Amino acid sequence: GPRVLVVGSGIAGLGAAQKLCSHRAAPHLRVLEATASAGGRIRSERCFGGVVELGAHWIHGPSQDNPVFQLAAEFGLLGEKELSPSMIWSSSGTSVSLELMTEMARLFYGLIERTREASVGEFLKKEISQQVEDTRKRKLAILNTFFNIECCVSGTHSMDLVALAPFGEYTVLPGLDCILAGGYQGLTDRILASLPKDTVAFDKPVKTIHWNGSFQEAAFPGETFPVLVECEDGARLPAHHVIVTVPLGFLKEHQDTFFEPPLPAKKAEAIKKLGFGTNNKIFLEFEEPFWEPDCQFIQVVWEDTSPLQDTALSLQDTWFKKLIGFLVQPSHVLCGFIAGLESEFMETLSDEEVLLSLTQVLRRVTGNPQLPAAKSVRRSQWHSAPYTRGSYSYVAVGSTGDDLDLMAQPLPGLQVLFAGEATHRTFYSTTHGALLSGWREADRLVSLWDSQVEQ
């Protein structure tokens, strides 16, 4: 059969491989993965006696039309409940009014809905200013955390970097978001296991994809191929088709050396224009819980902060002021979330510094200087991960939904194909977008092979 190489073993690459290998008449296919494991941004780790998810954690919109929900159900990865609660702490050591929280959430999320109905950030700030003394500062402080939560959601440093006009293109499927009781990496491990033996090569990063050529294979019959995949280890792999599923952050940093000749101008510009920000998780293990047992999300409100003063490239007073709060993981574990440049800075700190700094933050925020220190920390480092360089894509100011279609556009003769979350116009930044993109590329190849047969 035709020689196919898939670059990257995340859900997009695995989905593309799954669909191509399932074909009763299958191609000769290999998946080349840079790192030691499969799953990419789906990464479940044994920690604190349980499982921590360093990447994807939720199925967004777990309903019939969500292929990730469909697969998790087929694999037995969902809990019974899935198959059918916040505490607000100020940086002053006091609780925040539930009524004021509701008022600000109604103002903020009402405006988010309106943006989906220049930048998202600028629209939100202009409207909030029109809506706008200790009650005023409190209201602006609450709003500041809501902006920081939207930064985590979009995977951006600032909502001022998020394009307004394309914002509504992102599709949210019905259903309350759920986790996988069976762990998220169980999904990618199951797909990987369905592939023929030795389909995936680990610790095998690709250096350059050479295309638009006539490359002779090493052995008889010295058959010529249009593509040659050059690995970092010197491996010289001829192919008829290469499906690239590498993250947009990797493409932004290396597209100039990763493709030979360079990509067509429109695709090279799409890579540069689209957003690719950082969102990280900080898991903190505690000997005893200090929060209410019914609590699920501890939202932190930073006193005297405001989103109206902030611009696209402004930093918070300290890196930890960008942290939104903590999700209780139901050992006693909390998961803090932090996006953007402050999150990239956190990655440069040692584990000890993060643990000590967040212990001091929690002591301040709870109004308890005796609060025991976290016993252990486990944090994601997505921006410094060399084969990812960030968390997920967004349609940045200066880019549009057409740029996500340009990411998906194949190279001549389908020599090189493109899948991955940043190739999906309406489900970018999700596991289902990434999965659907892999299936899309497999389907595109099958049509070409069916057409070669017919002629």
Ligand SMILES: Cc1cc2nc3c(=O)[nH]c(=O)nc-3n(C[C@H](O)[C@H](O)[C@H](O)COP(=O)(O)OP(=O)(O)OC[C@H]3O[C@@H](n4cnc5c(N)ncnc54)[C@H](O)[C@@H]3O)c2cc1C
């Ligand atoms: C912190 C975080 C939280 C998230 N939360 C959610 C959530 O709750 N729900 C959700 O739906 N989505 C979420 N996402 C997004 C989701 O995880 C991704 O959109 C999706 O998993 C990406 O799949 P992919 O196949 O496109 O890319 P990846 O999973 O990143 O796979 C790409 C692969 O290519 C490999 N690679 C890179 N360069 C090379 C090279 N040169 N040679 C060979 N291989 C290479 C990488 O090592 C990697 O394995 C989150 C992501 C992060 C990081």
